[PDB]
Design a protein around this nucleic acid. Structure first.
Ligand SMILES: [Mg+2]
Ligand SMILES: [Mg+2]
Ligand SMILES: [Mg+2]
Ligand SMILES: [Mg+2]
Ligand SMILES: [Mg+2]
Ligand SMILES: [Mg+2]
Ligand SMILES: [Mg+2]
Ligand SMILES: [Mg+2]
Lengths: 77, 149, 117, 190, 51
RNA sequence: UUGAGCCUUGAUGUGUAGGAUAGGUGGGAGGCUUUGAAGUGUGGACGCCAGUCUGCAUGGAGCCGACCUUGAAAUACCACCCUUUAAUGUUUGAUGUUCUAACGUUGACCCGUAAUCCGGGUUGCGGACAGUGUCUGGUGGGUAGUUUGACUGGGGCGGUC
RNA sequence: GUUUAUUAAAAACACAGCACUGUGCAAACACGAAAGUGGACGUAUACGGUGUGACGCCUGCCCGGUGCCGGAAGGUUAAU
């Protein structure tokens, strides 16, 4: 399902809001994308369905720390 | 990002600078093929320890691979016991492991392949000269005197 | 821009008009002028004169490469066929060789029909 | 430089041939290009004028002493009216217009001094300094400045001539001060 | 067709073109197809060219 | 590389009385050119082929002024430039050129595996495009929610408020 | 041939035939937030949509409006 493995981001519900202020149930979807990440410490490519923000989370924390987290909450990669 | 480099790296890098690169380039190419790394600050000082050490320290140690020759001109004369044929012309002859082994064997300790006797290298008696090598730019002259005993 | 000296004068001489273009040996267009584009329209431009005045116009335009000698290929019937080269000899040009290149079918395409005037 | 390289006037004869041509804005909406009554300039400059004013058969004995040379007459209004190569300047206000002897036919001369008591009273200086520069075609400014007898001493005209910015219109950016002439050209900013 | 005229002269010298092309096969092909009517033409070209 | 800004370097003007193809005002009674010219002779060239400029050159030494006319007088010289055009840049894209490593592969192959899924790997083909997320202009009876007045010798029409 | 099972069987629907138009295949199109699947284990002599309706003899003029197709220099114009 459209869930970022780094951040938990997922679809949210809201309204489109016309000029005349008509609300209509709508969705916001996270900017998802599956990305191969070279894990040096694992001589392997781990590919993650991540949100763009996710990627930035990975760039800052470093993929080892992030995978460390998935491992910590038994999110299987 | 910022990211600090590893190898030389083309139109931007250096060998250990703190450039700034588009993340698309950092992930996907550079860091994976370890040519650079996240400037995680933790790191940028991992590099400050690496800005004092090898450089400031081991180049006044090549100021010792250099001041070995401050003792190349303060003696400036070894003699070789090599005689003379029919007119003061060496009955012997002295090369590099003769001018490095008859250099080492005193207070003048040189590495045997650090003695340039361009050939003369050698074919007569008396005083000669040689080019003594310890550094790439700083060598030093002496005077050699094949003594006919 | 550039220079060439050795060249060719190309003239398209039809009945309604005659168009002149100077080009190097390798037919690569150096300058041009038309009997119609120098004034005269109608019976006006269908004249050996209008052609003469064109050949002229066309020189001051390709002397833009200090041309010196040029072969001369002549195509079509109608006036200014030859009158347009007389203008050229004088204009100030050596004039090597002269060929007629009016194309001739070995009887193929049916030509237009009428002209019940 | 930051101000104006007045020393950027270093083979004619004299270089008072340098000109106050500071820029101004377009006419977007409504805006004009005007010069007041003889723009003086905190600087005498050293100009002995020939000021042609329309005074009377009275002020020929002190209204000729006020930074000038002569003053036209009342007999010489239309009596000196019979030649083209025969015939700043001004006229005294209140109730006096001159288009019956100053309107016909393409010149520029309107400001002098409106006096009904003194021909050159105690304190009235400012006339014999500089001329007038109004709207020409695309803008205004055109005039003259300093000379080859000053350094940044004619830069009293720098903060007192390019400081002559009058209300802009609505869609412009009227600032760009430059001068020079008779040899080359240049300047700085504004 | 071709005149590669050489040195001393200025005149055209191309009387050649009044020996073949131009108004020859050109005035010819320019217009009405013909078909069987040249036969009527050339049938007068011999009645003439007899004398 | 090329469309728009903006900043310097150089262009140029056939209203009428005339020495003659006067752009508007302004400094302005002399600068200039041997820091090697007028004009003959061509070069690139703008174009209403009416004539202008110049890097170059044969060249070899003075032209000018209110001079009287013209609503406005100097190719005497210079400008801040408008008519409109042209040559480096600055940077912005944008259009374009390749690369491969993100990403697509509903080509081929290997293994998990006796598997037309899926995963990993190899290879080829594409490639920073495509595609998707957020934002945004357009279109949108395909769907949806509704509106579509009252008087009235019934109602509607007409008329009226 | 079909059809209003239960007041209409017909001139209505379908039909072979014809035309227009979309579609280069991961087709267009359609059921699906999606994966996936029909189209098709097909590939322009194929597949979809629309209208006309064996066949014979034919199918004239109009592009102003509305719809569509192409076009782009200018004008107008969104987030930014
Ligand atoms: Mg509805
Ligand atoms: Mg409701
Ligand atoms: Mg009612
Ligand atoms: Mg029934
Ligand atoms: Mg029945
Ligand atoms: Mg079909
Ligand atoms: Mg029907
Ligand atoms: Mg029809």
């Amino acid at each position: 399902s459209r869930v970022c493995q780094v951040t938990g981001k997922r679809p949210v519900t809201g309204n489109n809001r016309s000029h005349a202020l008509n609300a209509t149930k709508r969705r916001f979807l996270p900017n998802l994308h599956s990305h191969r990440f070279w894990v040096e410490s694992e001589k392997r490519f781990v590919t993650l369905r991540v949100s763009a923000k996710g990627m930035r989370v990975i760039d800052k924390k470093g993929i080892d720390t992030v995978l460390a987290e998935l491992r910590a909450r038994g999110e299987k990669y | 990002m910022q990211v600090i480099l590893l190898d030389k790296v083309a139109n931007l890098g250096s060998l250990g600078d703190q450039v700034n690169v588009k993340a698309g380039y950092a992930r996907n190419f550079l860091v994976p093929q370890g040519k650079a790394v996240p400037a995680t600050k933790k790191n940028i000082e991992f590099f400050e320890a690496r800005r004092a050490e090898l450089e400031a320290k081991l180049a006044e140690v090549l100021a010792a691979a250099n001041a070995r020759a401050e003792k190349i001109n303060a003696l400036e004369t070894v003699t070789i016991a090599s005689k003379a044929g029919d007119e003061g012309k060496l009955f012997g002859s002295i090369g590099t492991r003769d001018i490095a082994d008859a250099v080492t064997a005193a207070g003048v300790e040189v590495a045997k392949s650090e003695v340039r006797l361009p050939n003369g290298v050698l074919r007569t008696t008396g005083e000669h000269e040689v080019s003594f090598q310890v550094h790439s730019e700083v060598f030093a002259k002496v005077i050699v005197n094949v003594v006919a005993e | 821009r550039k220079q060439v000296s050795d060249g060719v004068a190309h003239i398209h001489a039809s009945f309604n008009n005659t168009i002149v273009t100077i080009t190097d040996r390798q037919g690569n267009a150096l300058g041009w002028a038309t009997a119609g584009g120098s004034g005269f329209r109608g019976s006006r431009k269908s004249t050996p004169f209008a052609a003469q005045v064109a050949a002229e116009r066309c020189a001051d335009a390709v002397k833009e490469y200090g041309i010196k000698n040029l072969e001369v290929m002549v195509k079509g019937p109608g006036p200014g066929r030859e009158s347009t080269i007389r203008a050229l000899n004088a204009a100030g040009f050596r004039i090597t060789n002269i060929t007629d290149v009016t194309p001739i079918p070995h009887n193929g395409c049916r030509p237009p029909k009428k002209r019940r005037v | 430089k930051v101000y104006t390289i007045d020393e950027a006037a270093r083979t004619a004869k004299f270089d008072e041939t340098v000109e106050v041509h500071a820029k101004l804005g377009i006419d977007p909406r409504r805006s004009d290009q005007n010069v007041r009554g003889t723009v003086s300039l905190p600087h005498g400059l050293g100009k002995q004028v020939r000021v042609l004013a329309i005074a009377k058969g009275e002020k020929i004995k002190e209204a000729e002493e006020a930074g000038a040379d002569y003053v036209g007459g009342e007999e010489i209004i239309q009596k000196i009216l019979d030649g083209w190569m025969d015939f700043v300047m001004g006229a005294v206000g209140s109730k006096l217009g001159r288009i019956l002897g100053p309107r016909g036919l393409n010149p520029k001369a309107g400001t002098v001094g409106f006096n009904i008591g003194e021909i050159i009273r105690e304190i009235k200086a400012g006339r014999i300094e500089f001329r007038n520069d109004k709207t020409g075609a695309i803008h205004a400014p055109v005039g003259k400045a300093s000379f080859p007898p000053e350094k940044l001493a004619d830069n009293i005209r720098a903060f007192i001539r390019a400081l002559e910015a009058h209300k802009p219109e609505g869609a412009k950016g009227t600032f760009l001060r430059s001068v020079y002439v008779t040899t080359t050209m240049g300047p700085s900013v504004r | 067709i071709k005149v590669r005229e050489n040195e001393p002269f200025d005149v055209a010298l191309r009387r050649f073109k009044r020996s073949c092309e131009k108004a020859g096969v050109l005035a010819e092909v320019r217009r009405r197809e013909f078909y069987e009517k040249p036969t009527t033409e050339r049938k007068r070209a011999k009645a003439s060219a007899v004398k």
